[PDB]
Amino acid sequence: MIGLVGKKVGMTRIFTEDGVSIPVTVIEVEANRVTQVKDLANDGYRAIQVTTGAKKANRVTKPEAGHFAKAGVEAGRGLWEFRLAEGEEFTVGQSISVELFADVKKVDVTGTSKGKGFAGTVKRWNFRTQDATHGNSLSHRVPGSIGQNQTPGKVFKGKKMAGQMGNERVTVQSLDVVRVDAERNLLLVKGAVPGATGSDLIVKPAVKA
Amino acid sequence: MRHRKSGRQLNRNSSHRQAMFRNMAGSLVRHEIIKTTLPKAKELRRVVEPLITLAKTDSVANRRLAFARTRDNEIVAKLFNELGPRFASRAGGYTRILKCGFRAGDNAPMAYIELVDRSE
Amino acid sequence: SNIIKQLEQEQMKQDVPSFRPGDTVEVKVWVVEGSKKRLQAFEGVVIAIRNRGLHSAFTVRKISNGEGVERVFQTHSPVVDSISVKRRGAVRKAKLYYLRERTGKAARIKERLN
Amino acid sequence: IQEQTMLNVADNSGARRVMCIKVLGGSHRRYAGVGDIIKITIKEAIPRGKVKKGDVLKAVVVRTKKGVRRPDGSVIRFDGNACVLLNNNSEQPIGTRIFGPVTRELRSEKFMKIISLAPEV
Amino acid sequence: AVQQNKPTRSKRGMRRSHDALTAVTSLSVDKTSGEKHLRHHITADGYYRGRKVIAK
RNA sequence: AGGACCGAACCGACUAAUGUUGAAAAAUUAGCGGAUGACUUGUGGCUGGGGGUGAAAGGCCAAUCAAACCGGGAGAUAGCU
RNA sequence: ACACAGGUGGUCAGGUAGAGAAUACCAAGGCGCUUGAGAGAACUCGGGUGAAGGAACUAGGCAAAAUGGUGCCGUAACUUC
RNA sequence: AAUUCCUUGUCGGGUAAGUUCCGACCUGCACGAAUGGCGUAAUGAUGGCCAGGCUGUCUCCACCCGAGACUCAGUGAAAU
RNA sequence: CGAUGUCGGCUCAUCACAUCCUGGGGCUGAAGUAGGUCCCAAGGGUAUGGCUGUUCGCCAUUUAAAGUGGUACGCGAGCUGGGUUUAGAACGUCGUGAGACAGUUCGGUCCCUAUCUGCCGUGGGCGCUGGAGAACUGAGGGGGGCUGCUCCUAGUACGAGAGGACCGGAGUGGACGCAUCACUGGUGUUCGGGUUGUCAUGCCAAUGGCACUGCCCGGUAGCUAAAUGCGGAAGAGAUAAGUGCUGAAAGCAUCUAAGCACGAAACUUGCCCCGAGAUGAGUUCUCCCUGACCCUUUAAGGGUCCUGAAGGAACGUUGAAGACGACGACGUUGAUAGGCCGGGUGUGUAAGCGCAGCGAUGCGUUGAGCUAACCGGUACUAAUGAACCGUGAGGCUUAACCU
Structure with a gap:
């Protein structure tokens, strides 16, 4: 489903x-208001753009307006798109959104990781540190070998080395839906979803289930 | 990493930071306006403003606590006598930071941190 | 936020007794071995923490037979059924780890409105 | 518990201090201490115990300082690390009487005899 | 550590392509006195946004 | 009394770490060994290079030593680069 | 070679605690070591604290961790007593 | 054996597992009596081994504090 | 040889298939269980210790297995130095001796600030054809691809018994990867308390400085694992070995020649992430700009004034974002930080006074007083309105449509 x-x-x-x-992550899945639906004639994909939350309209740009x-x-606060397989949706918003998540038993949650x-x-990877005391001149947590001498003569594209971690989209699948509370627009899901508290989240029905 | 963490180290240890902000709070209470670097003024807000908030209520325990956090009896007397009633109506915000230009010897962001109801 | 922990206030038990650290309490915990459910008593000196909301706990140490058993108990858990305060202990710290680890160390009882 | 871990013995036939030479079950299993079976040498033994020093046989961990975590979040921590000695081929308790507390986590298969003999579960 | 061949004057200029200074591009004007100041800074005759705030 | 013991000054230099375009052409920091003796130290003096001096290492003789440094034979010689 | 973390003989020796010229804090006296301001990544250096296990580390308990004082008892093999 | 090539000799010990160690055997490639032989209390910043304790050596790292590293202003090298 | 560091180990890998495990088969001297041999198959996985310097080796104990090789017998501008490969010493042997040993033994300096390629991250400039603000399509690319144990079927098939099912289901783990901090913990020099030595604030009292945060005992936020969640799939297509159907050349035969069908952890998809610089620069939605003059070497172009739009950037308060950029929130129509208010938490009954006592000290006021990054509020402070950039209707060739 969407x-x-x-x-x-x-x-x-x-x-x-x-x-x-049960460790529950509460998500404030407020009512999702459709902004656009795409037909197969105009675009190759059939989908709904949805918005949620409030933006003050001082910061609303006139194209977005x-x-x-x-x-x-x-x-x-933003527009996000969900592709639809079969179900037809109007351009106006739905009144309550968690009513469709009532029936589903396991969900997939996408978020920007911390x-x-x-x-x-x-x-960043789970590299194993070299021995602390016997010798080890200035090489305790440094990466060791990265390549294999003259015959490759280069380090490969997939090499595991230091870089920025986090600030990335990660999806966790097959999370049990503990409770659906319509009045507070609250979805309680078992386990830990990605992101800091107050970050945006994409909740989908389980592709695995 | 630094997540939800207060406190600016300013490249000094904790004992120096405590001593420096005690002396800076004493100077700010004494002259009512001082020129510092801008992060120094910003953490100076955090040391100076609870002193006046304590100094709103005048008791021997509060004067002893202010002496513990200043070690200057003249500053304790000024906090509990001259200031305190002046900032009694003010619900926080005794300090105002006005950014000046840049220091000569090192290009440091400079600021004047002042008491709001300054007589001058 | 306020949208969270209203749910906590829904789940918090309202029958929780009040005890200082040091008190020798008895906790009756339900155990469902099969269809039959029975209460089990655990009595010992408290090393607890103040109520952190729904997430509250007590640590209780008893010498069962030669072995010092420490159980942390979730306060508002449905398995914890009744806590009886029993003996009251007067001690000068919240965390009694050093006092409990010593063998033959018995805390005093003081009844002076404390 | 881990390899090179000394443990007390709950049962009578098992004698005194024992050491875990191997953590059975698993390819690179590092730490196992709740209901797991570990290969055991006898580092020091009293002569009344049937087993003797330098003898390898299995055991099951019954008490761990790390402690089990209950489903509600409860942690039962037992001071001291303890084992019940088991035969290598049979994995059955050598000791006739088990001493000290045991956990309900040791309720599966041959450990039913251990919780039957042991007083406090 | 060392180079095997001398880097070129071209590659020197290409490295210093992104080493360039940035102009101020705007100066705020105080209402009471006409002097231009750095925005959110004191006017250097003692005025902030509309009032004299320091004697010096 | 002690070529006694523990241990500062003092003298030395056992392990590690940093340094290694260093603060330093052998140091710094934690620990180390002797410290009333065959100790250590100041001030002068004596021994000069196939020579000295050596509780002996080819150690030392001015950051130089299986033969110091300076000038001379000397533009030695170089079937080698 | 330096406004260099080294080397440089003697003399005086306050208080409190301490056997003490150890060391801690202070006198008198002298200084903050001639680049500073931020931010608080990896990594490096010097430290602090660690669940459970504890030499499984490693060439090797390297390093770290521990023990440490004064008083009274008490103390083995061997011994040149 | 500071010596034995074969050799990790053979046994007994200590460990779960011991080319090290300790003690015997003699089959001394290639010990042997001031080129000293055998023992020896004490002593050793000596060589080898085994314990108790203790711990980030380790499993497996985690957090924290300072000096750098990053940015900003000033001065401003090096090997090649 | 005007220099290409030498075994081993540590860290980090990559490839081949002459395949150790897991998958699919054939033959078996394959009753079952378990094997042997061969073919296909490289997606993932493929121990810990004792001895010794060791690759080895011997052993003890794991596991589904603890593959075989290449990569300067991979990897020293990554680490080690036990090994060899120096100068000291000693023993055995040879030599008159200096000395020697493809003998032994004890001891014995391992330097680099990264220009280029290469990767890992992260930006700036211009392009994509008027300028913007969004949301995406997916060409390509990467990640992920492991398995054990128990139970049902079933003590059934198989079997004389002993034993005991390569189907099909269910749970439960090990190792691995990802997220998270609700719990259990760790840390927490930025909170509270105890306490030793000394000095100071005149003194008592109360505090503060210094001694590793002086030593400790606890500890909020944050981060984190040892905590908890989650996953590697099922499918789908084309196949490898293989098994077949129909079927001639070769009236029989035959899996192949025309045809037809199954068949793997491999391949392509399905799961996740990146991704239009995908110069082949894509799609959709919306906003915004429709004034003159002069010269004029006409896809043509310049100069001048007027007007600068949508929006961006700068500045400021900042963030569970960050090396710096970048990104996100907010900027007086304001909750964006600090302060303030209330709470929460953590520590543990403050000071002061009174009482008991000879005093140390105790008891009462008192779960007091302090309290952190946390929660809910509040304009008290700082987020000033300018200004800056960005334009003025967007080029030439074949269409309906009406002139």
């Missing part, structure tokens, strides 16, 4: 009667 956009508002535990302490003005002038800076090799 996914929805929510804002991550934190991690808690839910305590069942047996006492299993005209795009908002078509299909009902309500500014949101920025980890210029991570080293030991952090």
